[PDB]
Design a binder for these strands. Structure first.
Ligand code: GKS
Ligand code: CA
Ligand code: CA
Ligand code: NA
Ligand code: NA
Ligand code: NA
Ligand code: NA
Length: 322
DNA sequence: CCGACAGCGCATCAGC
DNA sequence: GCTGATGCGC
DNA sequence: GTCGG
């Protein structure tokens, strides 16, 4: 919005650092900078102004000054005209092709979707599914479709065993008008820290032809593809990414809190937890002893139990953007 | 000045 | 056959 | 690239 030109530039530099440079911490630095700028309530007018924000340092302030004076960044222009950097960058858009495989393909003259399709033999199973659904995976999911997807998953899970608990987390649980994918957290009273559960559920979703493809799957984590059924004369829906994570029941609501997010919120809640003598991670909340030693995990029967320990007013998922 | 920067489940590969 | 390292997505 | 110890 106010600073969309700047945040595009920084996101473009981030993707380059990750995909071409293979410099994951510079990618994250650029993303962190773009996220604080996108949240700033003023149209930035200088590099110096931007450097006041956390995560923006000298180099990005100089890039902002150049962008503001000229409307472009020379570094980006050279990157965009570099065929190797652009080909590597494009290929990483396939799910399962990362910076390493992208660079490898491009070294041997494999640079286009068409090249991938003629070189299907050289792709692993995840990359093959990424290629198959290349356009669909980059489409967003309207909330009304997420709602329909929730009803299918929740119902079929219930048909396998009435005592499963399944929760759709991610941006959907925070009320987003659209989501990138579907995140399902699953548990069962029979699965604890100290004790086919996932397979049964996946198989059922396949039998009703909801789940169409499998990227990866083990005893606790399923990553795959699903699609809503359409009516006879309608256009078919896009295929969608869906993950299902089976979490032990004594860690479930810590799981739910973590996978709901958002990232900033989790961070701010973990910061506050320490301040009160507790430490939270994706699995547990533990009390901190006088010297700093983490104690045993506390009992957590609900998401609100976690806020109670750290004497926090319960935040509705709708309000967990920060 | 310089090391940290999140880290885990699953797939795949190198090595034994 | 197995283990441990690494790519990958998140 | 940015931060902080
Ligand atoms: N779905 C998912 N999320 C995470 C991270 C946690 C922490 C983050 O605050 C929360 C939301 O992350 P996610 O990438 O799922 O994005 P979301 O907020 O759902 O946006 P979108 O994916 O575009 O709908 O999930 C994972 N772990 C590490 O990133 C993971 O493996 N899968
Ligand atoms: Ca998500
Ligand atoms: Ca399609
Ligand atoms: Na700054
Ligand atoms: Na990719
Ligand atoms: Na996503
Ligand atoms: Na350095």
């Amino acid at each position: 919005t106010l600073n969309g030109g700047i945040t595009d530039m920084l996101t473009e530099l981030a993707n380059f650092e990750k995909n071409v440079s293979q410099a994951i911490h510079k990618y994250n630095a650029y993303r962190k900078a773009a996220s604080v700028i996108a949240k700033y309530p003023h149209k930035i007018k200088s590099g110096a102004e931007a450097k006041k924000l956390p995560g923006v340092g000298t180099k990005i302030a100089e890039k902002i000054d150049e962008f503001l004076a000229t409307g472009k960044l020379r570094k980006l222009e050279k990157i965009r005209q570099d065929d190797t950097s652009s080909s590597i960058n494009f290929l990483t858009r396939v799910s399962g092709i990362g910076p390493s495989a992208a660079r490898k393909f491009v070294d041997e003259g494999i640079k286009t979707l068409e090249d991938l399709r003629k070189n299907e033999d050289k792709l692993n199973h995840h990359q093959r599914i990424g290629l198959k659904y290349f356009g669909d995976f980059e489409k967003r999911i309207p909330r009304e479709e997420m709602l329909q997807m929730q009803d299918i998953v929740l119902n079929e899970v219930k048909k396998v065993d009435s005592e499963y608990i399944a929760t759709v987390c991610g941006s959907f649980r925070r009320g987003a008008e659209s989501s990138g994918d579907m995140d399902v957290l699953l548990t069962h009273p029979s699965f604890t820290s100290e004790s086919k559960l996932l397979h049964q559920v996946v198989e059922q979703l396949q039998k009703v032809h909801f789940i169409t493809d499998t990227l990866s799957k083990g005893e606790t984590k399923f990553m795959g593809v699903c699609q809503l059924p359409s009516k006879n004369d309608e256009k078919e829906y896009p295929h969608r990414r869906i993950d299902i994570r089976l979490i032990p029941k004594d860690q479930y609501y810590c799981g739910v809190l973590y996978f709901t997010g958002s990232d900033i919120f989790n961070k701010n809640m973990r910061a506050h937890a320490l301040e009160k003598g507790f430490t939270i991670n994706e699995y547990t909340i533990r009390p901190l002893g006088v010297t700093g030693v983490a104690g045993e995990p506390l009992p957590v029967d609900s998401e609100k139990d976690i806020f109670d320990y750290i004497q926090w007013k319960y935040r509705e998922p709708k309000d967990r953007s920060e």
